[PDB]
């Protein structure tokens, strides 16, 4: 951008991503489920595609860390800030980091990895925080009961599509 690195949107439709490391909290296979289900949420509303990688540098480098972890924004231990992400662009951009100090769960009994990844990925794609409390892009983790009926706020749809267009 003007001062900090990063671009408004990815200049390509077919993105690649990698789950760098894993959180002990949950079985490796369950992390894959949460992350992937998370990414799908945005593929359905756009012409975007996501290919998983296991080596090399993907666009979206997903990883778990605690306290100091490389970038200029160390995590705050248990509670408060659960995760952060970067906007589209080269290098660390698009990446998403997760606070391991939190209790990651694939169900409604902890901090739902899916819900958070879905939110963070929105940033990797170029979205900002929403004021609409019903919008996924609202920063405050609102944990919903039955996961099966999770739905995107129209607002997020209008948001992500105004960038990448709707599916063809």
């Amino acid at each position: 951008f003007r001062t900090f690195p990063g671009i408004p949107k990815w200049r390509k439709t077919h993105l690649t991503y990698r789950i760098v490391n894993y959180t002990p909290d949950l079985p490796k296979d369950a992390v894959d489920s949460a992350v992937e289900k998370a990414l799908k949420v945005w593929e359905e509303v756009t012409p975007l595609t996501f290919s998983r990688l296991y080596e090399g540098e993907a666009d979206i480098m997903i990883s778990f860390a605690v306290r100091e972890h490389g970038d200029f924004y160390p995590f705050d231990g248990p509670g408060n800030v659960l995760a952060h992400a970067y906007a589209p662009g080269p290098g660390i951009n698009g990446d998403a980091h997760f606070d391991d100090d939190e209790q990651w769960t694939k169900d409604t009994t902890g901090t739902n990895l899916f819900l958070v990844a879905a939110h963070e990925i929105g940033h990797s794609l170029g979205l900002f925080h929403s004021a609409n409390t019903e919008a996924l892009m609202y920063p405050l983790y609102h944990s919903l009961t039955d996961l099966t009926r999770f739905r995107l706020s129209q607002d997020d749809i209008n948001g992500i599509q105004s960038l990448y267009g709707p599916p063809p």
């Binding site: 990063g6 952060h84 209790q103 409604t108 009994t109 901090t111």
Partner: protein
């Protein structure tokens, strides 16, 4: 950036300064691309006397450069409006983030005001409010009070957050007590 906000009491205990101020200027990148800062006019200081401030020592509140990475975003129409900013001190600078408890003073319940002014300190050294993320919550030590608001109605500003405080009652026991005001 995604996060679970703090209960006002936890906001008070864990913060370094609990100032009251007005947002004087729009965000500008100071001497670092990493943080954006807001010029602020500090009126009342409820906590952090180990940093003075009186009425004009703290004139800037820092926060990350971009929302995605937790930067706080302020958008009010009247600049003389007053806010309760509970923040930390990196170096000698007040930092705030997406989760930092920042709410206009006038929106604050009489109870919350009373807590910030006098009662929250009482629960800091011993008690600790723990936010429930599900229905069975999680039994913790007796010194932890289960913050069970949001789960009902789905909000950041419920009843326990507007009228309750986690104060001690017996050795190893902390209790949700009402701070009527």
């Amino acid at each position: 950036c995604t996060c679970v906000p703090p209960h006002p009491q936890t906001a008070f205990c864990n913060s370094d300064l609990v100032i009251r101020a007005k947002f004087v200027g729009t965000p500008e990148v100071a001497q670092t691309t990493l943080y954006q800062r807001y010029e602020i006019k500090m009126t009342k200081m409820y906590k952090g006397f180990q940093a003075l401030g009186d009425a004009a020592d703290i004139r800037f509140v820092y926060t990350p450069a971009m929302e995605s990475v937790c930067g706080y975003f302020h958008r009010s129409h009247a600049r003389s409006e007053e806010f309760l900013i509970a923040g930390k001190l990196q170096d000698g600078l007040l930092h705030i983030t997406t989760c930092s408890f920042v709410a206009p003073w006038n929106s604050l319940s009489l109870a919350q005001r009373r807590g910030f002014t006098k009662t929250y300190t009482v629960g800091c050294e011993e008690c600790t409010v723990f936010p429930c993320l599900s229905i069975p919550c999680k039994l913790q030590s007796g010194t932890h009070c289960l913050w069970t608001d949001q789960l009902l109605q789905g909000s950041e500003k419920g009843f326990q957050s507007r009228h309750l405080a986690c104060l001690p009652r017996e050795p190893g026991l902390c209790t949700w007590q009402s701070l009527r005001s």
